[PDB]
Amino acid sequence: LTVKSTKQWTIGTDVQGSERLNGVSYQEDALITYGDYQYVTFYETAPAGYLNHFVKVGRRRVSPSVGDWEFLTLDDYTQKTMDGHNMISMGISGDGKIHLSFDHHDVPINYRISKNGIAKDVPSKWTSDLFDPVVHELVGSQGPYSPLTYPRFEPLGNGDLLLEFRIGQSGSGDSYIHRYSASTGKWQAYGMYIQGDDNNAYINGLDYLDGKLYTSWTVRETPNADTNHGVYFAYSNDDGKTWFNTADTKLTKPISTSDDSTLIWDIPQNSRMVNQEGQLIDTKGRFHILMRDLLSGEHQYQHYLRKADGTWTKNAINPAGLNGPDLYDPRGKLAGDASGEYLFGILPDPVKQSTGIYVATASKDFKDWKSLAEIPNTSTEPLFDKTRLHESGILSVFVRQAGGFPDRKLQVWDFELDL
Ligand code: NA
């Protein structure tokens, strides 16, 4: 596997503040290809200036040829909270509607949707009046909608879309799932799916494939990030309603954090393992987790693999040149190609201030981590476009630069792979 071409686009000037609001690990998702177009969402500074931001949505054609990015500005909702949790997630349902949820730390939901199926019936002009107003509920469903943190969308096989989030707080919280029907345009409540016990679960993502939904998490005892422990796994065959552990034993609904039957790796507190890193169901149905720890005596990224035979392995990701991360350094992701043979680590390097792209192969049990490419000058938790990789073999990554405001840009990097 090699790189055929590298291209980049600047899509905006990043916002100013003590926190990163753009390029946050648990954006799910920031960058999406649907049909022949790619979409991206981010904050830009509003005319009021410092500590006033608007959500922007960009689109560009990517098939059968790539055209120019265009942007709309949602100038009816001003983001004002300088808190690194207050990021944006986007999802696109099979009716072509684009959904956004954003700007939360332990507050009520903020959600909006496009009026029509703009990703399906693609409009000529790209303007803010394509979107309905911000609301604080999910029409058809029920709360609780507060205190909410961490909206995450997952598109299902039939065009429906899940929205998942935590209700409660760091160190005492539960998570919930809601399902949007692309046939009726109504949401329904799947209810609480994981319940804290004077702690909270921190999932790594949602991963849906061929009718199964996969998640992994660590449990956090207090608002101190040193109090994460364990790596846990469960999956569902019914889009979030009921769940199983790795041995296919049905769990209680909700899953409790006190239930050790979902633990796949013991990792104590003070291991320097961070919450909400990365996960991946590969196209062959092998599940992967990206985390980190200091348990070897050095800080290293860690790859957990759920093998076809049922067994779990844990391998450090330690290719030449990669500096290992500590607890508060930027988080990475794992991406997969269409074939399921190639695993990409998209790993921010805290020494280099860059994003490395490393590749391993299923033929070598993913032990053969090799440097494939680099994105220079990043201070970001890198995020990629699953569908674009599957469909065209192009690894497209959304990044916040390193550097000072207003030099620090937002960009999209495309690596064309020679599959
Ligand atoms: Na607690």
Numbering used by the authors: 1 to 419
Text of the article:
Recombinant enzymes that were heterologously expressed by the secreting system of P. pastoris are often glycosylated, and high-mannose type N-glycan was observed in protein crystal structures. The crystal of the N247A mutant was isomorphous with the WT protein crystals, and their crystal structures are virtually the same (Cα RMSD = 0.077 Å).
In this study, GA-specific l-rhamnose-α-1,4-d-glucuronate lyase from the fungus Fusarium oxysporum 12S (FoRham1) was cloned and characterized. The results described previously indicated that FoRham1 was an l-rhamnose-α-1,4-d-glucuronic acid lyase. The active site of FoRham1 is located on the usual anterior surface of the β-propeller fold.
